[PDB]
Each structure stands twice: as structure tokens, then as C-alpha cells.
Paper text:
We selected a bifunctional enzyme, diaminohydroxyphosphoribosylaminopyrimi­dine deaminase (EC 3.5.4.26)/5-amino-6-(5-phosphoribosylamino)­uracil reductase (EC 1.1.1.193), called [name], in this pathway as a potential target in Gram-negative bacteria. In bacteria, the second and third stages of this metabolic process involve zinc-dependent deamination and an NADPH-dependent reduction at the ribosyl group, respectively. [name] is constructed from an N-terminal deaminase domain, which carries a Zn2+ ion, and a C-terminal NADPH-binding reductase domain. The overall structure of AbRibD is an arch-like dimer and most certainly not a uniform globular entity.
Crystal form I, the apoenzyme, belonged to the orthorhombic space group C2221 with two subunits (A and B) in the asymmetric unit. The interactions of the phosphate group differ in subunits A and B. In subunit A, the phosphate accepts hydrogen bonds from the side chains of Asn28, His54, His81, Thr85 and the main-chain amide of Arg84. In subunit B, the side chain of His81 points away from the active site, while the side chain of Arg84 is now within interaction distance of the phosphate. The loop between β4 and α4 differs in position in subunits A and B (crystal form I). This is a well conserved sequence that includes Asp106 (present as glutamate in a few sequences). In similar fashion to what was observed in the deaminase active site, the oxyanions phosphate and sulfate were identified in the reductase active sites in forms I and II, respectively. In subunit B, an additional interaction is formed with Arg181.
Residue numbers in the entry:
A (entry chain B): 3 to 358
B (entry chain A): 2 to 358
The structure:
Amino acid sequence: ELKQDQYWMQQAIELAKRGLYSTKPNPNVGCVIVKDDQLIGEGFHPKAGQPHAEVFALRQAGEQAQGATAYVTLEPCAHYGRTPPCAEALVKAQVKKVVVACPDPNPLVAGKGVQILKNAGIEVEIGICEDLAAKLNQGFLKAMSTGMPYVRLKVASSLDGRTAMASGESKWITGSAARQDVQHWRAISGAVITGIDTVIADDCQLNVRSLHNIDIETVAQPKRVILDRRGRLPLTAKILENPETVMVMGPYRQELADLGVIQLEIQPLKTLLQTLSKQYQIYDVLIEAGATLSSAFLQEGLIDEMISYVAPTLLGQSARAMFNADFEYMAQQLRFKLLDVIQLDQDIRLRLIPTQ
Amino acid sequence: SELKQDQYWMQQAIELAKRGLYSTKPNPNVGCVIVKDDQLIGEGFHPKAGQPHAEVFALRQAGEQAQGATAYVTLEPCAHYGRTPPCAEALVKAQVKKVVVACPDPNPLVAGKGVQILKNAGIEVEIGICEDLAAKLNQGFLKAMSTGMPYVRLKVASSLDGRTAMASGESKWITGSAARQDVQHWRAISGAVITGIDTVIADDCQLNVRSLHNIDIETVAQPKRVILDRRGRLPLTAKILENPETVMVMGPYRQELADLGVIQLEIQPLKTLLQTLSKQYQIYDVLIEAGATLSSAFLQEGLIDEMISYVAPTLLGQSARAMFNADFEYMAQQLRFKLLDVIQLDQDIRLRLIPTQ
Ligand SMILES: [Zn+2]
Ligand SMILES: [Zn+2]
């Protein structure tokens, strides 16, 4: 009966995943309506500006929603935003019970939806499959509760922890399946951060161009954030193809204004992350940068999760180190907790969380 | 579905053959089932060199009923009197109708002669059934018998950034205990573990098999420990010597070593050393547990069949000791591998890798 609740929530968790690339800055939310042990309404949130999962499920439910039980992965909202309050829609639909996975992470609003629900004499349960549900909105839950984005760092290295022989060669040690995987990480990110070096060396794009069974046009594209402190970004760079989705931290440049590039002031990495969240509503950040900037992020403790692609090759000791720090003692190691390792054809990928 | 019926029974035989993986060397892992009217009537594996063969055990169980039965066996039944009588003769004596064989036995003492003994008695022989699966059961033995070179697994452990110690040489607790315990398995199927003198002085390692998940260690046919020591620096107090009878040293002849019972090997190139271990000492599976230099030399000389790489979820930084210490100037020089698989061992991962050659 708790297990019954958990079963229904998991369904809502699965529906929530259906807007994964298209919801940002809004969260992923799923909702099921259950009447007499029967599924009678399903909804997810497809896109910021569109109806919330609850609205879509209640539409399906119809007058049948009366006395039913709604399961929603995130507390139903109580405030008008782009759309009306779900708490009220659920009051209007005259449901018996609401089962919530994640309370609203915004502490100014946490419980407000519950309060409306409880005052309408609707019973409420919170925390069911919270852990699983929270995996749907790592950036969102983090940013709304702490003001900082969830930051993922992508690194690609050899078996022996190296990335290149020489810099600026644009050589690849990882294969195409790993390329495909990177797309997923970009597609859930509000921004992809890199340093001018990568741009100059690689003419990289850092956008989302192919995801299996999804058309590009449905994807809420990450902003491309370039850290360019000396303003050496050439106007010819492929990244400037879609200038509206480019941010550039570096000296004010009139030529970049004329293209509509967002120009950010030079600020500490930590502050940059704060600015992206607060000003631009970027809650998921991905770093795809060379060793210096990657190492800086890691050493400044700014990485929530490292996504490490390892190619089955040895580059040898004089090849470029993936990580630039000069540690003297074993006690100085940056240890991580391993989440999982998967195979991507010839490469593997690890996801790693800092420990303390 | 005759082919399907055969594969079913052979797969059974292949399962029996996994039952003495640690105890068989230098002898092969071999499984055998005996099937009569689709009933399993006899079962056997080879437990240990000097002990009877899978076939004998399987035949003993089947008894009189083996007459007209089909024997499934993962390796060609043997044809010679070795430590024991020939199994092909035993199959002939039991009057089996048919013998289905996974792998031919390239052991020159057998090599088609068991098959031939059976054919000559009018027993049907089919060969090749689940060969690829069965071959996995004796990578070393089959390689050694048919080429004179052992199967060589290179073990390395490193941080994510490819480092094995600090610049000082401090190195404790990079990989964790599950990885360490996995190494036990690799040691236990190996005829020899090869290390260099530097490892012995630095770690005072033993490189034996001391624990194995859910296995009585008494069953383990211990690897020999092979120490490369060009200049004879091996201290007599080294822990690796507390069991001298299973140590071999490649270095200058020392009478104090001869007196402990240590096999002394002539200084020779690595390829030759590997052939020596195969042709002279019946070592068909080799595990290298050595430092950067010796490890890299085996790799660069093309002497590794499989690399087993343990990676810890940690970063030691750009000044820490490299796990692989060649210096390549060009990207084209990179040493490429094919990935067999990766698994998680608590917090470490383990990659198995086959050199691209
Ligand atoms: Zn809502
Ligand atoms: Zn035999």
C-alpha cells in the first residue's frame, strides 16, 4: 500500500523523463491519476510555457478525477507563473489524495501547494520515491535550494590519464558512441562551458545536433558559454553560428554586441555559476574544456559530477595530463565516489561524485 | 536441433570444466558429460594434475550404461600414458557410440591422436561443438601447446589520471580491497607471476594466492613467482622467499639461492624468458605484476595477450608516477587496445583489454 504508492510514483517518474531535453528551465515532472486502482490520467511537462504535468493528467481524467488519487513527482505549484497553480486545478478536480515525490525545492514556496491541498481537505503524502524522483531534476532542485547549478564536467582521457600528445591538434582518442552520449549531457544542460583555447583549437560547436528518436527542433538548446578573458574569440568561429545562444566572459566587445552575443563580466568561476543560475536560469551546467580550466573547476570544488570517458589507449608519460594539479602526498588526492561505469563501444564512461 | 541438443550437453561439460580452474595447472581444465537416451548418466571434470581425467570420472559414474552413450568432452580425449592412462582407450573400452569434442588438443602428445583412436574403434567423433566457448577455459594451455608461448595477462592498477604513486614513491591505497581480491583470481589461474626486483625491494610483495572468495586455498595450485633481477640484488630476507621452492629468479647465479631451492634462470630477453617458462617449466599462463618500466617493456615488446587494468576513482595529479612510462612524440604511436569488458569492483573498475596487433 506504500508499495502501491511507490508503483504509481515510478510511473510518474517515467512520464517525467519524456520532456528531459525540452523542459529547461522548468523542471521535469510527471503525473498519474488513479481512481479505483486504475490509471485514468497521465501527464508530463513538455516545455517551459506549456501546461504542467498535472494539467495534462487532469485533462485525461476528466470528471472522473473526482475522488481519485494524483501522484506527482514534484509538489503541485501554488503560484501563477507562465501558467496557473496546479494545487488549485487539483482542488477543482476534487481529488481525494495527492502523493508527492519532491517538495518544491524553492524554500519560499515549499509546502504552499501542500497547504492549499490540505485546506481543501485533500489528503497529502510527500517523499515517496523522493530519491528517484530527485534524479529527474538535479540542477533544478540544487539551484532552487542553494542558488548554484548542478555542474557536470566532461573529461576524455586515455587509459594512462592523458588527453593529447601536443595541444591544438584536435585529435580524438574516444569513439563515436561517446560523441552520441555527450549529446545527452549537453541536451539536459542549460549551458556548456568551455575556454577560448578549445574554441580556437577545435572550432567546436558545443550544441545538440543528434539524439536518437528526437528531432533537434524540440530540444531546448544549451547556451554556449565561452571563457575568453583576453577577447581572442574570432568572429569566424563555428560556435558563433547561432549568436543568440552564445555567452562570452571577457572584455566588452562591440562586435559581439552587434551579433547579439550575451557578454558576461569577468568573474570568479564560482560567481559565474551563480550568475548563470540567477540571471539566466541555467541550473544544469556542463564543462567541456581543456586541462587548465577543468582542473581549476575541480580544485575550486565546483564540480558536482564528473563524466569521464576513457579510451582503450596508452599515450605515454610525456602526453598531456588530464588533470594539472601538482600533488606531493597521497593525502592530497581528489577522490570521488563512483556512481557507475558503462561501455560505449570501445570506450567506457564513468560518472563520479566528489566525496569528503 | 541435433546441433542444439549437442550444444546443450557440451555447455554442461563446459560448466563442469569451470570447477577446478585454480587447481588444474599445468594440466588443462576439461569437462565431460555422458548422455544416454538424452539422460545424463555420468559427469566429470579434471580436478588436479596427476588425478584422473574428466573422462574417467564421467565414465566411472556412467558404468555399464556408457555402452552406446554419447560422451561430450571439452577437449580431445588424450592418447598417451602420462601421469595417467589414455582416455581415448577408456572411451573405446566403455563402448560409447559417439564422442563430441569442443576443442582439438594441440598438445603434441595428443593432437588428433585421441580422435584417431576413437575413429579406429568405429566411434563417431564430432569436433568443434561450442569450441569458442570451451577455448576460453584454457587460453594459456591452448596457446602454449600450439605456439610455445604462454598466455600473458598484464596487471596494472592506477588512478583515473594514470598514476601509481606520488613522485616520492608513496602509493598506499589507490585501488581498494575488492580490486586486490580480484587479483587473487588472476594469480590463481596463472602458472607464474612475473615481477621485477624493484617491486620486491619496494613492496616486499609475495605474489602468491592467499585468499579467494568461497574457495579452500588448499585446492589452489600456487603460481610460481618469477623475479627479474639482472644484477642479483635480491635480499635473502625478502618475504617472497619464505617459500623458496616456488620462486624462480632471473639473474646471476647465486649458490645461496641454489641452496634455498630457488630455480635460477639465465638472464635472457623477455620473449625468450616467456618461451622458457612454457617449454621448460610448463607455465602456460603468466601474470605480470611489475612496475612501470618492466610493465611497459612487456607491452612495447608485444608480449601481452591481455591487460587487466584496475582504475581507482581518484586523481593523483601530473607529478605522480606514470603507470606506463614510454614517451611517444606522436599520436600515431599510441598503444591501442580492444576492450573486452569493464566491471565495477566496489569503488574501482576493472577493464580487460586486448592489444590491437
Ligand atoms: Zn504546476
Ligand atoms: Zn585423458
